[PDB]
């Protein structure tokens, strides 16, 4: 429940995971890097981390295919601003993430850019989950999975599904039918509130 | 429908010097609640305060409140 | 040039010496005109002690060049010391300006106001204006509590520098002249995150910022949120009203507010607009589902500013612990209920508070939030999970909370209590299969390639 | 001011109408403010004209700028003549006088242009 | 015939003398609040809501009397309005806050009778002026709906309108007519004959706080956190007059003097605590 040196660690994810607005590839690398170390964290002590979810769906719009259009979730949408989105590179394959992604890169290729884009939408995919995964109890799975569901149906638009490949296709297609089937389980499981059942005192 | 209650929160505990717990019945009465002080001596603290008596506990701002913890420490510099 | 201030001083003193004791009169004079460039000379310099010798000879010229007993002193010269001082890149010489003599004085403070006025009527000295009017802070009380007076406190009992409302009033005119030239993005921000407590104050009637408030407050977003104080100070003072001020409010409350700056000064309006009286349970219990939806989303160091006012509200209206705990009172919806699970009747992205159904709902984000990395935030959900016994719970002890007090916290514990480790460590720290030990791997190494 | 304007012209205000009659930003409000408020403005602000009839460079200026901004509000409803008709009336008292109300001046501005000869004949005297 | 009526503010309530315009007794026997003092029309007993959701009942000479009749707490929830009959001398009405309007005779220890029907805050209702209106009460909630109870069937409402703002304030005609029901800035008079509406009017940039009628049930005048108040007619309904205060009001009444009910003053209670009483005397 506590520690002096851990759960501040969890609180340092915190502050970098809710706050940088990615300006960088380099960033939304890093992000993903402490997105599956807060994974790990968490893990079989099932707690539950806003700002993860927030920056999940925050760079699944921000790698912009088309648009962030609107009624996206309730996470702050921000802006790509040196154009930091997917292409037209539905040949470019998805790799796995490599730490020299935390290297910055101006004069970087518009190849490289598509390829780490795509590594970077399939690890998020992969990411996306494994926290369903972990995250099927939390009786808030709707209320915290229904913008994921959303951005999710957004990108399996034909506008975006043109700049996609059928691989990222195929994993966000297993994406949506796991959470439906999951938001079908919490909607039946779900019951209203009884909380203080006082035990009266003698 | 906008109502200012700035006044509407009033009949809870207060802290003092001594004891912790402290509802609202009148300023004489909490301060004979008030352990070591009397009926007598509470009225000549009220008038010593400028406090109207016709208020209640609760209804009294913090500079006159610590007025009254004020003059409950030193009763001497104030005459007596 | 230190010779020349000192003879530019021992002028100065035999300037006053000479005012002081008193064909001929027109040279007497114009050494005094002579002495007005020279001390435009030496302020385009000590340009600090310059200003000094200015003010000290400004009130010789009011003192005694004039026979009436009235102290006139000159305000077109003074309104080139004015221009100067603005156009001067020296910002210790605008310090100095501001708290030593216009932070003081009165005088100075209406006729600088008045100077202002004049020579904005006729964007580097825009700013260098604009940091001088922010550095005027506090509005004085009453024409008793004006009191000061660098020359001639007036006699005259019904004079204008004597009247509170005319000092207000030019003050008001330096204001609007710059806010009708306009001013930049940045400078409109601060002057509406100040304005409330040292600028709205200084208006004899600031209508005209009801106008330009309820503009930039309907152009939407955080610069709504900083003029929301704006608008309820008006309605406090003068109280103009909005047409539909709580659904406007409904609207405002959005994702971003939680990750705000300004969520602090905007949750201290939030608690009063919610701590009036004459409010509905369907439009509180709109406002607590619509913040908790935003909870799930919220950063920790907003969630503790928020859920010990979700106490407060369910203390001080009881009827929306319904929220708090729904009992089905029939067997038929029993068994409708545990045939197919509740669904939510509280409809997100609604338009009117008071028509969302966020009564029948339920504070399912709150009872999952107790979930929580953060072991206070667990308790600060637990609080509302276990009993209403305290009387109230203050915000200011969860105000001003963020990650770096959340940081400075956990290192201003103790330098080590003796910790707890995780033992059998797997070697398979970095291993991609490790399918001899049946672990199975981290789930980082499998999404990560370390070659 | 515009939506000070507004608010004080649908309840029927005069201290706010005089908060704003107080006061380029008289042109900024009229083209703020609304249509069957300009004439409500326009009945009360004959009455004005009607009840004090001293400086008019404020007022007049604004009935002007008002029947620039929102003049064919008016026509769009027109049913309110009398609004506009009880102006037309109090527009002819107040050219009575100028029957001869220069008739007025100028032997009175020649009287006024002997004193400014007979102050120039003394401060050279 | 009398020289008595009664304010609130705060947790005590407050009688004044006509005459005198004076406080004419305190009383401070509220656990509370006091969220109207009410005085049977006989002229000796008030009858108050605290926000504890008890009631007082007691009685009071024409000094300072304070002998406590009964009260009851079965609302378990602050009552906000309560009301005599105006025609018998034993039963009276209070909505509560919570949904409930509810029906009480003096004499047991039970309320007569309860209608439900409101979701919101409930929070004004009396009874219907007639003598053919023998057994009717409305009841204005914040739910945006007034509703009207026949009291001999303890159903639903016999009559309901819903507005499209929290209803502030209701009250109906002598004439057993009509009814204004005051809902934010304007306000509608509704007929109860034919359960039409009849007109919306507003002149108020504020929700108007209270409502009360003038001098021989010919005029009405509107109170609003304008500080506003304003006169209209009974038959044209137009503007006739208003006056503005310096505070945001939150209360009002004109009161008469005696036979022909010829009216003394106008008191208004503010949002800063000011009682002011302009006299008009002939």
Same mark, same amino acid.
């Given at each position: ?202 | ?80 | ?451 | ?125 | ?103 009480? /005779? %003096?004499?047991?220890?039970? =309320?007569? @009778? +309860?209608? $439900?029907? #409101?979701?919101?805050? !409930? ?67 509704? /007929? %109860?004959?034919?359960?039409? =509406?009849? @007109? +919306?009017? $507003?002149? #108020?940039?504020?929700? !108007? ?74």
């Amino acid at each position: 429940h506590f520690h002096q040196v851990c759960t501040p660690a969890m609180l340092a994810i915190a502050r970098y995971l809710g706050q940088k607005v990615p300006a960088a590839l380099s960033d939304f690398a890093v992000g993903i890097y402490l997105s599956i170390l807060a994974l790990q964290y968490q893990d079989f002590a099932k707690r539950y981390v806003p700002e993860m979810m927030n920056f999940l769906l925050n760079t699944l719009c921000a790698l912009a295919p088309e648009r962030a259009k609107s009624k996206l979730g309730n996470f702050p949408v921000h802006e790509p601003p040196a154009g930091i989105r997917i292409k037209d590179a539905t040949n470019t394959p998805i790799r796995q993430l490599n730490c020299g992604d935390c290297l910055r890169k101006d004069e970087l290729s518009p190849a490289e850019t598509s390829s780490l884009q795509i590594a970077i939408l399939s690890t998020a995919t992969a990411i996306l989950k494994s926290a369903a995964d972990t995250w099927h109890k939390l009786p808030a799975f709707i209320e915290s999975f229904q913008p994921a569901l959303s951005v999710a149906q957004h990108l399996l638009t034909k506008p975006n599904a043109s700049h996609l490949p059928s691989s990222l296709t195929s994993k966000l297609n297993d994406l949506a039918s796991h959470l439906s089937r999951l938001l079908q389980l919490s909607r039946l499981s779900r019951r209203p509130l009884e909380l203080h059942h006082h035990r009266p005192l003698a | 429908s906008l109502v200012s209650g700035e006044k509407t929160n009033f009949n809870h505990i207060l802290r003092l010097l001594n004891t912790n717990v402290d509802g609202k019945q009148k300023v004489v009465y909490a301060l004979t609640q008030i352990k070591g002080v009397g009926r007598r001596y509470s009225n000549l603290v009220c008038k010593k305060a400028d406090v109207d008596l016709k208020k209640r506990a609760g209804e009294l701002t913090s500079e006159e409140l610590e007025r009254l913890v004020t003059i409950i420490q030193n009763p001497l510099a104030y005459k007596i | 040039p230190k010779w020349s201030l000192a003879a530019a001083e021992a002028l100065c003193r035999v300037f006053v010496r000479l005012l002081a004791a008193g064909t001929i009169i027109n040279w007497l004079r114009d050494r005094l005109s002579d002495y007005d460039g020279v001390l435009l000379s030496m302020l385009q310099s000590l340009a600090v002690h310059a200003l000094v010798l200015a003010m000290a000879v400004l009130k010789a010229q009011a003192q005694h060049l004039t026979d009436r007993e009235e102290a006139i002193f000159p305000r077109s010269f003074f309104l080139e010391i004015i221009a100067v001082v603005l156009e001067s890149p020296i910002e210790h010489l605008r310090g100095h300006f501001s708290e030593n003599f216009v932070k003081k004085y009165d005088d100075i403070r209406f006729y600088t106001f008045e100077a202002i006025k004049h020579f904005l009527t006729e964007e580097d000295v825009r700013n260098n204006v604009f940091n001088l009017l922010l550095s005027i802070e506090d509005v004085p009380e009453s024409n008793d509590s004006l009191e000061n007076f660098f020359i001639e406190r007036p006699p005259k009992k019904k004079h204008p520098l004597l009247s509170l409302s005319q000092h207000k009033k030019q003050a008001q005119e330096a204001w609007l002249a710059f806010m009708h030239l306009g001013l930049s993005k940045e400078q409109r921000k601060k002057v509406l995150e100040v304005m409330s407590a040292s600028i709205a104050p200084w208006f004899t009637k600031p209508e005209m910022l009801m106008d330009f408030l309820t503009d930039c407050y309907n152009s939407g977003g955080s610069v709504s949120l900083l003029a929301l104080s704006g608008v309820f100070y008006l309605i406090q003072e003068r109280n103009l009203d909005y047409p539909e001020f709580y659904t406007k409010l409904y609207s405002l409350l959005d994702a971003d507010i939680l990750h705000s700056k300004y969520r602090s000064r905007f949750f201290r309006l939030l608690d009063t607009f919610l701590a009036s009286t004459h409010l509905p349970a369907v439009l509180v219990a709109s406002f607590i589902k619509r913040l908790a939806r935003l909870a799930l989303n919220a950063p920790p160091s907003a969630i503790v500013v928020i859920v010990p006012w979700f106490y407060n509200l369910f203390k001080k209206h009881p009827l929306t612990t319904f929220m708090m705990h729904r009992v089905p009172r029939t067997k038929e919806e029993r068994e409708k209920l545990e045939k197919d699970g509740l669904d939510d009747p509280f409809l997100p992205n609604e338009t009117d508070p008071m028509e969302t159904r966020a009564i029948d709902s339920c504070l399912w984000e709150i009872v999952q939030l107790q979930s929580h990395y953060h072991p206070n935030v667990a308790t600060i959900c637990k609080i509302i999970s276990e009993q209403f016994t305290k009387q109230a719970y203050n915000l200011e002890d969860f105000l001003d909370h963020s990650y770096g007090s959340l940081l400075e916290a956990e290192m201003t514990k103790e330098v080590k209590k003796p910790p707890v480790i995780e033992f059998m460590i797997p070697k398979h720290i970095f291993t991609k299969a490790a399918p001899e030990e049946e672990k199975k791997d981290s789930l980082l190494v499998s999404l990560w390639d370390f070659g | 001011l515009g939506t000070v304007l507004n608010q004080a012209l649908r309840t029927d205000d005069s201290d706010l109408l005089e908060s704003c009659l107080q006061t380029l930003i008289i042109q900024n409000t009229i083209n703020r403010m609304d249509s069957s408020l300009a004439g409500t403005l326009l009945s009360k602000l004959a009455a004005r004209m009607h009840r004090r009839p001293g400086r008019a460079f404020g007022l007049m200026r604004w009935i002007q700028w008002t029947l620039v901004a929102h003049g064919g509000a008016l026509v769009t409803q027109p049913d309110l003549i009398n609004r506009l008709t009880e102006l037309s009336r109090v527009l002819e008292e107040r050219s009575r006088g100028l029957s001869s109300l220069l008739a007025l001046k100028g032997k009175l501005d020649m009287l006024d242009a002997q004193l400014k000869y007979r102050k120039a004949l003394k401060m050279a005297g | 015939t009398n020289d008595l009526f009664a304010v609130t503010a705060g947790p005590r309530v407050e009688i004044f003398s006509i005459r005198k315009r004076e406080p004419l007794k305190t009383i401070g026997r509220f656990d509370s609040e006091a969220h109207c003092g009410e005085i049977r029309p006989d002229g000796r007993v008030l009858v108050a809501g605290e926000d504890t959701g008890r009631m007082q009942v007691f009685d009071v000479g024409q000094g300072t009397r304070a002998v406590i009749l009964k009260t009851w707490h079965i609302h378990k929830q602050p009552v906000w309005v309560t009301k005599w009959s105006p025609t018998e001398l034993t039963t009276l009405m209070s909505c509560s806050d919570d949904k409930t309007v509810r029906l009480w /005779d %003096l004499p047991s220890n039970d =309320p007569t @009778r +309860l209608f $439900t029907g #409101h979701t919101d805050y !409930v929070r004004c209702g009396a009874f219907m002026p007639g003598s053919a209106n023998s057994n009717l009460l409305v009841s204005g909630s914040y739910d945006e709906t007034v509703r009207v109870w026949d009291a001999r069937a303890p159903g639903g409402a016999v009559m309901t309108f819903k507005h499209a703002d929290p209803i502030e304030d209701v009250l109906p005609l002598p004439s057993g007519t009509t009814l204004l029901a005051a809902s934010g800035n304007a306000i509608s008079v509704l /007929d %109860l004959v034919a359960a039409k =509406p009849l @007109r +919306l009017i $507003t002149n #108020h940039q504020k929700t !108007v706080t209270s409502l009360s009628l003038a001098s021989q049930g010919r005029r009405v005048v509107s109170g609003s956190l304008d500080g506003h108040v304003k006169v209209f007619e009974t038959t044209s309904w137009n503007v006739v007059a208003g006056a503005k205060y310096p505070s945001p009001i939150l209360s009002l009444s004109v009161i008469t003097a005696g036979a022909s009910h010829d009216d003394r003053h106008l008191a208004v209670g503010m949002q800063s605590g000011v009682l002011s009483i302009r006299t008009r005397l002939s």
